[PDB]
Amino acid sequence: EGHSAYVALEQRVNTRQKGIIQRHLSPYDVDIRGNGFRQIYRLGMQKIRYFGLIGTPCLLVAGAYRGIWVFCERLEDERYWSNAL
């Protein structure tokens, strides 16, 4: 791990770290249900908003393609029903 590209990068870029205090609890003292429903709600809402954002162009283009698909499908149905093939 010490001879890895990401370790080399962190040594080149980051300074010698100082003044950082981390606190960790053992999993036997942490409840798996502790922050469950709140996180479910928050993440669901976030993903709903984000997909509503980034999905709009796809929705618009899919609507245009659906219009074209309907037109072509009924054109070909009319062609087949009149022996015009």
Binding site: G19, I20, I21, Q22, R23, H24, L25, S26, P27, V30, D31, I32, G34, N35
Partner: protein, 241 residues
């Protein structure tokens, strides 16, 4: 394009349910008495019938036919009554012969037929109960051609194979055209997939076991993530004016 077969509720297309085996028995009867001389089952052996038939019945059925044997002591050819391990009898010697007995058409092998056609079982049913319809205008039918809307192109070289009261079922069920079509379709479904019930059963067992593993491993993953999901950070401030 040709007619799309309707989707029918088959007993083996149901929840927690497998082949009927009564339809399979009756379809075996119809196979023996109707299309044994025309179509072939290259993949089915007599011992395969020891699934809905008794051992002695299978033995007698096998002995009812004749099979090639090793050449005589002088090299002469021989015949021999069949056994359990012999494949069922072929109806024709070679393709040419077949084509000669069917006015140029070649009846295909029906060993995997339900797997070889789009919407298999339904299609076969729709093929057999579709023969009497009026011929469309502008279509010229030879003396050995018939109009079946489900065949590719609408014209088929197979004469209507099923007629009412053609076969006397052992269990007493009336042998109408739809009934016989249903029975042969079930029998051919068994021929194509003789592993239906074992496949469904193994599916249930595997899904249940994987579900147990998934629940336990999901709990353990959530437990191990607790160490990091609750981590806390603090930065000692600088001295700013």
């Amino acid at each position: 394009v040709d007619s799309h077969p309707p989707a029918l509720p088959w007993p083996h297309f149901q929840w927690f349910q497998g082949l009927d085996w009564r339809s399979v028995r009756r379809g075996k009867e119809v196979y023996e008495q109707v299309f044994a001389p025309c179509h072939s089952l290259s993949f089915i052996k007599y011992r395969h019938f020891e699934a809905f038939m008794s051992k002695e019945e299978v033995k007698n059925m096998a002995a009812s036919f004749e099979v090639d044997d090793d050449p005589d002591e002088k090299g002469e050819a021989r015949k021999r009554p069949g056994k359990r391990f012999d494949t069922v009898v072929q109806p024709y010697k070679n393709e040419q012969e077949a084509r000669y007995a069917n006015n140029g058409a070649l009846p295909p092998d029906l060993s995997v037929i339900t797997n070889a056609r789009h919407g298999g079982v339904d299609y076969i049913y729709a093929l057999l109960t579709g023969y009497g319809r009026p011929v469309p205008g502008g279509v010229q039918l030879s003396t050995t051609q018939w109009y079946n809307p489900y065949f590719h192109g609408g014209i088929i070289g197979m004469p209507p194979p099923l007629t009412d009261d053609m076969i006397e079922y052992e269990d007493g069920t009336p042998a109408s055209v739809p009934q016989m079509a249903k029975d042969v379709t079930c029998f051919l479904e068994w021929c194509s997939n003789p592993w239906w019930d074992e496949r469904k059963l193994l599916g249930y067992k595997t899904i249940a076991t994987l579900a147990v593993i998934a629940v336990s491993s999901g709990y353990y993953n959530r437990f191990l993530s607790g160490l990091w999901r609750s981590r806390r950070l603090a930065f000692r401030p600088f001295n700013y004016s």
